[PDB]
Amino acid sequence: EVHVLCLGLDNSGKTTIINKLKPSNAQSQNILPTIGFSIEKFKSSSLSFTVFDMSGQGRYRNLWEHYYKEGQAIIFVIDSSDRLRMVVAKEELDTLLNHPDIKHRRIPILFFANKMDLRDAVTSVKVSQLLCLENIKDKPWHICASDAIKGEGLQEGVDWLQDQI
Ligand SMILES: Nc1nc2c(ncn2[C@@H]2O[C@H](COP(=O)(O)OP(=O)(O)OP(=O)(O)O)[C@@H](O)[C@H]2O)c(=O)[nH]1
Ligand SMILES: [Mg+2]
């Protein structure tokens, strides 16, 4: 019953995170850059998900807005270890948030400050400061640190998302 858009730059960990939310039997073992986008399903405590897992490469970011009218929730993923590319991420977040099909809907945004395990990684608090998430006033949001390979942090996000729905 719940349609989610998974957005963020390429190499942020989007497909790794979505994969980890799946039952063990359903999980992919070799995750490659997404070609355009994919549609996945996962399940939480009592919620069934359809996820538009978009490629975040520059080549395919044009596709995102085509699917905005069926984001009932957004999962936006940040590579915590890459401050330089985080400037590009913030630009895209700001465009997303101001888009005609997004700006007037109270849609919940879950952020993941992913790749928390890497030495250069910024904390979820620091990410929230850097992206200026405090400025999001008309939508519910939450941010988590995550290590998507291990699965650390994903439970809290999914739990927050489920509450919002
Ligand atoms: N160390 C570490 N590596 C991660 C983490 N999450 C994802 N990765 C790795 O980062 C690379 C990119 O992960 P993907 O899930 O393919 O990234 P993406 O956002 O889906 O990229 P696109 O589909 O190209 O937009 C892969 O090699 C993953 O194994 C993490 O939390 N920690
Ligand atoms: Mg991907």
UniProtKB/Swiss-Prot annotation:
Coiled coil region boundaries: none
Binding site for Mg(2+): 15, 34
Binding site for GTP: 8-15, 34, 53-57, 114-117, 148
GO CC annotation: axonemal microtubule; axoneme; cilium; cytoplasm; cytosol; extracellular exosome; intracellular membrane-bounded organelle; membrane
Location within or outside the cell: Cell projection, Cilium membrane; Cytoplasm, Cytoskeleton, Cilium axoneme; Cytoplasm, Cytoskeleton, Cilium basal body
Transmembrane segment boundaries: none
Keyword list, A-Z: Bardet-Biedl syndrome, Cell membrane, Cell projection, Ciliopathy, Cilium biogenesis/degradation, Cytoplasm, Cytoskeleton, Disease variant, GTP-binding, Intellectual disability, Lipoprotein, Magnesium, Membrane, Metal-binding, Myristate, Nucleotide-binding, Obesity, Protein transport, Retinitis pigmentosa, Sensory transduction, Transport, Vision
Molecular function terms from GO: GTP binding; GTPase activity; metal ion binding; phospholipid binding
Source taxon at top rank: Eukaryota
Membrane-topology annotation of the record: Peripheral membrane protein
Disorder: Bardet-Biedl syndrome 3: A syndrome characterized by usually severe pigmentary retinopathy, early-onset obesity, polydactyly, hypogenitalism, renal malformation and intellectual disability. Secondary features include diabetes mellitus, hypertension and congenital heart disease. Bardet-Biedl syndrome inheritance is autosomal recessive, but three mutated alleles (two at one locus, and a third at a second locus) may be required for clinical manifestation of some forms of the disease. Retinitis pigmentosa 55: A retinal dystrophy belonging to the group of pigmentary retinopathies. Retinitis pigmentosa is characterized by retinal pigment deposits visible on fundus examination and primary loss of rod photoreceptor cells followed by secondary loss of cone photoreceptors. Patients typically have night vision blindness and loss of midperipheral visual field. As their condition progresses, they lose their far peripheral visual field and eventually central vision as well.
Protein name, UniProt field: ADP-ribosylation factor-like protein 6
Native species: Homo sapiens
Gene name of the encoded protein: ARL6
